[PDB]
Design a protein around this ligand. Structure first.
Ligand SMILES: O=C(C[C@@H]1S/C(=N\N=C\c2ccccc2O)N=C1O)Nc1cccc(C(F)(F)F)c1
Ligand SMILES: O=C(C[C@@H]1S/C(=N\N=C\c2ccccc2O)N=C1O)Nc1cccc(C(F)(F)F)c1
Lengths: 251, 251
């Protein structure tokens, strides 16, 4: 079985070769392809990329912050709001609004075959801009044979910085939900609309491309946890993570 | 360049071999895989499948009906509400609610680089069921180099009946929007969550698999059209459609 990270490497390669020039909101140069998908197994492994060191601690901490429902930006001082944007996962507050995350968990428990196990995230800058603002990301969950799978659709994906961080974030989220629903993690599927590489990330990425992936690490949850709000950073241990060196993509 | 329909055939094959048994809402047997994607070129061709005759007339007529915003079910007598569900494309009436379709068209015109060119469809049975009900489908548009591309994400896809019909529907929609925005059709990308085959469709599909695709036909728009509401069925001509025989999938 080939290494899942090869998908990510192949997508970078594909964008470098066939990507077309396209400006973003601020007009600052990307190579762009529309429509991509990769599948990462979560079965006795965890897709924390190995061709560069991924900031796992920030992944964990930021996900925990989102599961809390916190809007205090400084409440996230664990030592530009993207790329996960989980601000409306819990409320739209101790009972005000729909709780998307809790609804996902309950549906998985009350009707695992449901095709509507879906949670959305919005870029907060979009909210005052218009009514019925489009989500930045939709997350769909899926259960078969006691395995929980997750598919993330992002309307756009920064391949150098955001994507590897998002792969780890939603994989971690899936591990958490599986844990509290008594299921085993299955697949994480990552699907993009506008998949793009910033011009200034090109050379660093060309170097990363020449690196050989190493076996993905494992994620262990060290305690028995009951409710999604109960997880702490200390309950998690990444083991066997042997990545190539950090790459600084200069945003 | 291999025939795009081969993607569809390969996905059927993949579901037959690796699909797992999963019940739907009514509990009536499918083989299921989670997460799929196919890309169909719209450049001087139109992805109306050839390994069985696709009911083009119903495709066109139903899309036109949705663009109208009609809720009179009998208003669609052009001779179970799925699989497109375009009921909220225009209103949520001559000015009441967000007009998703018109907003897509305007954004394409006022800011073609926008990553938020998105329109959603809901299964109407979901609406009274809960607040913030998940869409059945999200449709994202994308513009580069005067080409309009479209990606449809469906939370679930009936591979035998719904999928081929949806491929033609969203391809047609893309042709229409391109026409009125002065762009050329690019790619239609079809992405599924729960991609599935009903048990009773298996044998018919196994037979369809042994059929060789023929070149896709072309779609011609016969008149110069200005606003999306102005299209009529008569403005469209499918040419060079030489499909294998009709296959009845017995729902
Ligand atoms: O600096 C960031 C940016 C993070 S990091 C990120 N994406 N990371 C990608 C990434 C990280 C490590 C290795 C490879 C990667 O691609 N997205 C974010 O929102 N977050 C942050 C972390 C700690 C503290 C602070 C604060 F609060 F601003 F000081 C911010
Ligand atoms: O019977 C249908 C079902 C259509 S057809 C469809 N999907 N078609 C798939 C398909 C069609 C032709 C060939 C191959 C296919 O896979 N989905 C639908 O909603 N629609 C219809 C058409 C005309 C008239 C009526 C009415 F109003 F009920 F009488 C309904």
């Amino acid at each position: 079985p080939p290494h899942g990270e090869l998908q990510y490497l192949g997508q970078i390669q594909h964008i470098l070769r066939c990507g077309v020039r396209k400006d973003d909101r601020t007009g600052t140069g990307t190579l762009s392809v529309f429509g991509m998908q990769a599948r990462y197994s979560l079965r006795d492994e965890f897709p924390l990329l190995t061709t560069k060191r991924v900031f796992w601690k920030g992944v964990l901490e930021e996900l925990l912050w989102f599961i809390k429902g916190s809007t205090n930006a400084k409440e996230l001082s664990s030592k530009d709001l993207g790329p996960v944007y989980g601000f409306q996962w819990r409320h739209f507050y101790s009972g005000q609004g729909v709780d998307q995350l809790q609804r996902v968990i309950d549906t998985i428990k009350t009707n695992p075959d449901d095709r509507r196990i879906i949670m959305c995230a919005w870029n907060p800058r979009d909210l005052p801009l218009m009514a019925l603002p489009p989500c930045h990301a939709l997350c769909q969950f899926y259960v078969v044979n006691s395995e929980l799978s997750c598919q993330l659709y992002q309307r756009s994906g920064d391949m150098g910085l955001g994507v590897p961080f998002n792969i780890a974030s939603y994989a971690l989220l899936t591990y958490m939900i599986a844990h509290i629903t008594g299921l085993k993690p299955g697949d994480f599927i990552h699907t993009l609309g506008d998949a793009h590489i910033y011009l200034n990330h090109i050379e660093p990425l060309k170097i990363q491309l020449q690196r050989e992936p190493r076996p993905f690490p494992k994620l262990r949850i060290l305690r028995k946890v009951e409710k999604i709000d109960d997880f702490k950073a200390e309950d998690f241990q990444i083991e066997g993570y042997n990545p190539h060196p950090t790459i600084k993509m200069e945003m």
